[PDB]
């Protein structure tokens, strides 16, 4: 067992998480009426750690379609309307022990 | 200073984050051509810790519009087509020292 763990709905962090969640639900709803918690049937919490990778990368369009092999070292386009380049900023959230990675943020401006 | 910290683009976690990010960029692009890193201009990493709150909550629609006061203790609707209830599951990602909260996951089924 390495999963979540029960917590009383009294504990303040729960209390704040709940109000937050409910706030967000109402904010996103199309209902003109306000909804609120009727009953918190179960509350669990879990401390997690991960690593954010913040990459500032320059990307170039290669000459290879995504349907061919050897894309890793494939030649960049150099022709007039085919060549494109972009400066990008990536944020990857990694949780090592789980082997997972998540693209948290991603923007690119064609330079 | 409590922000990110430089890392060589050699370090494997960076290397994996980069391939991941680039993979995700290509996957989401409308381009038939494959793009790849031209140059990693900057690489930084940062270890973060937070708490996931996992709430299983039953919500009820109140009689108050979102434009009035005292929504916290506002009466639930009980009339035929106005009363609604929903069982929901919320995941809130909190980063204590920063006072931030994020709604990571959210589903509700009108029961
Ligand atoms: Cl851990
Ligand atoms: Cl920390």
- Check CB contact of A83 with chain B, cutoff 8 Å: no
Query: In units of Å, what resolution does this entry have?
Result: 2.5
Strand partners, A106: A90
- CATH number, domain with residue A17: 3.10.450.10
Q: Are A86 and A59 in contact (CB under 8 A)?
A: yes
Does the CA dihedral A22-A27-A29-A34 come out positive or negative?
positive
Task: Quote the number of domains for chain B.
Answer: 1
| Any A CB within 8 A of B36 CB | yes
Closest CA to A61 of B37, B16, B9, B17: B37
Q: Do B45 and A38 touch (CB under 8 A)?
A: no
- Whole-angstrom distance, CA of residue B97 vs CA of residue A101: 23
Of B13, B44, B76, the CB nearest to A94: B13
Q: Is B107 on the interface with A (CB under 8 A)?
A: no
Length of chain B measured in residues: 111
CA quadruple A11, A17, A20, A21: dihedral, nearest 10: -130
Of A32, A48, A55, the CB nearest to B52: A48
Task: Tell the residue number behind the tokens 């494959």, with chain if given.
Answer: B34
Nearest to A37 by CA among A48, A28, A47, A24: A24
In sequence order, what are the residues at sequence separation of 6 or more whose Cβ sits closer than 8 angstroms to the Cβ of residue B2?
A: none
The structure was resolved experimentally with X-ray
CB B38 within 8 A of CB A59: yes
The boundaries of the domain holding residue B30 are 1-111
Beta bridge partners of B61: A35
HSE (CB half, 13 Å, CA atoms) of A66?
15
Helices (H), chain A: 12-28
Cα dihedral A69, A75, A79, A81 sign: positive
Cβ–Cβ gap A103/B24 under 8 Å? yes
Token pair 């999963």: residue? A3
CA–CA distance, A35 with B60 (Å, rounded to integer) = 5
């Amino acid at each position: 067992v390495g999963g979540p763990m029960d917590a009383s709905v009294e504990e303040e962090g729960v209390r704040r998480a709940l109000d937050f969640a409910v706030g967000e639900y109402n904010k996103a709803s199309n209902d003109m009426y306000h909804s609120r918690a009727l009953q918190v049937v179960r509350a669990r919490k879990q401390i997690v750690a991960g690593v954010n990778y913040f990459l500032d990368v320059e990307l170039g369009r290669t000459t290879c379609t995504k349907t061919q092999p050897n894309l890793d070292n494939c030649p960049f386009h150099d022709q007039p309307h085919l060549k494109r380049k972009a400066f990008c900023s990536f944020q990857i959230y990694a949780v090592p022990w789980q082997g997972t990675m998540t693209l948290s943020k991603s923007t690119c401006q064609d330079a």
